[PDB]
Design a protein around this ligand. Structure first.
Ligand code: A1AH3
Length: 167
């Protein structure tokens, strides 16, 4: 459980690896995997779609029940649902959609949700379909999260760019 290997250490508590988050989940057996979600938990073409496909759509069905019962999340908020076959829990976190003009300051609130869990496998929030500057997302993570976060960045071009400017 929580057996993370091959990650580069960025700070005392933040680590990064060039990998698919789904493949990492199957190897590391994490207590918590983080999804980069929207307020409707409608799992689209990035990390959310990859995680969902790996559960054979069970994540989406559970998400449909959560949303019908509780209504949409707020931007910067989160909820904990099952991790199905990938993890004990999935922490669904909503970063701001910068492509739709949502406030970038909400990325700090988004990463604050990680602080409620001792160890997480996670993606870089808002850095794909939501269009935020990935260098900013990584630095906000580093400056906000105090628990142990292992970031899986599937895009090798981006991984190399983040590592080169960070170290
Ligand atoms: N690298 C990388 C990626 C990425 C893509 C696929 C994978 C993978 N299999 N393993 C690891 N990483 N990874 O991880 C980052 C997050 O990008 P992502 O688009 O998921 O999140 P976001 O918060 O921007 O947008 C939320 C909306 O996207 C809908 O999926 C969802 O339902 C919401 O509507 C980007 O750098 C992205 O290139």
């Amino acid at each position: 459980v929580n057996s993370f290997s091959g990650y580069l250490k960025l700070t005392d508590n933040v680590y990064i690896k060039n990998a698919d988050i789904v493949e990492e989940a199957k190897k590391v057996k994490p207590t918590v995997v983080v999804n980069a979600a929207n307020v409707y938990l409608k799992h689209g073409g990035g990390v959310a779609g990859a995680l969902n496909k790996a559960t054979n759509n069970a994540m989406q069905v559970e998400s449909d029940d959560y949303i019908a019962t509780n209504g949409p999340l707020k931007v910067g908020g989160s909820c904990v649902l099952s991790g199905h076959n990938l993890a004990k829990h999935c922490l669904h976190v909503v970063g701001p959609n910068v492509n739709k003009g949502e406030d970038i300051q909400l990325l700090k609130s988004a990463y604050e949700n990680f602080n409620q869990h001792e160890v997480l496998l996670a993606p870089l929030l808002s850095a794909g379909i939501f269009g935020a500057d990935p260098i900013h997302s990584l630095r906000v993570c580093v400056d906000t999260v105090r628990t142990n976060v292992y970031l899986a960045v599937f895009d090798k071009n981006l991984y190399d760019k983040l590592v080169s400017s960070f170290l």
